[PDB]
Amino acid sequence: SLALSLTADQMVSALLDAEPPILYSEYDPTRPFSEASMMGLLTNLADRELVHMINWAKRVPGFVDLTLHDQVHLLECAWLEILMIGLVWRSMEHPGKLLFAPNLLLDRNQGKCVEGMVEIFDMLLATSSRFRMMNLQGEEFVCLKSIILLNSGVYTFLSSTLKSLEEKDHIHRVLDKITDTLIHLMAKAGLTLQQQHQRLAQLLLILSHIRHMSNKGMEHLYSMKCKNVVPLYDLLLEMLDAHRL
C-alpha cells in the first residue's frame, strides 16, 4: 500500500488516474473584457480548479502519508505553480495563446485588459514554447506536476520535532521515485543515458522558472485583490494569504 514500492509504470498509472476533471469557464461572457471581468473569470476558474486540486493531491502517491498540517503546507506553497504548469501544458498546441479552459483561449493582447497581466502572460507563453521545443510528453508532465506538489514547500516547513524530519525524508524518497519514473520513461522512449540525464535536468530547470512565475503571479493577484477589483472565494484567499503569512 506504499508509494515507495511502486514500479515506474505503476507510478505513471497512479498519476494519470489522479487527474482532475476538465473544467469550462463561466458560459457566455460580455464583449469586450474589462480589468474586473477578466480577473473575475480567471479567479473563478482558479478557485474551481483549486477545489479539484485537493482531490488530485490526495491521489498523488505518498501525499496522504503526510500529516494534515504538512499536506496543507505543500498545497499552500505549490497551488499557483500547479495551476500554471497545467495552463502551460494545455497551451502547447496554441502558439501565442493561453488555453485557460477549452472555451477560454486568450492571446497576449487580451492580457493587456488587466494592469500588469501581459508581463505574466509573456512568461507563461515562453514556458509553453519551451515545452513544445522539448516535445514534453503527457507522462512527463504528470511527473513534473507531482514534483511541484512535493518539492515546493519541502524547504519551508517549521522544525516540528523529529516528525518534521521523518516527513521531509518521506517526501524526498517519493521525489526520488518520481525521478526514477522520469528516467524510465526516457529510457523506454529510446534516449541514451547522456540524453536521459540532459532531459531530466532541462525539465527540472524549467521548474525554477515556474516558481518565479508563481511568485510574480502572487504579487499580481494580491495587487488586484487590494484594488478591490475582484471578489475571491475563501479557498483562493487562504492559498494567497499563505504567501503573506
Binding site: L68, V72, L235
Partner: peptide, 11 residues
Amino acid sequence: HKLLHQLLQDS
C-alpha cells in the same frame, strides 16, 4: 487555516 485543513480530512 481551517477551510483547507477541513477539506483535506474528509472521505
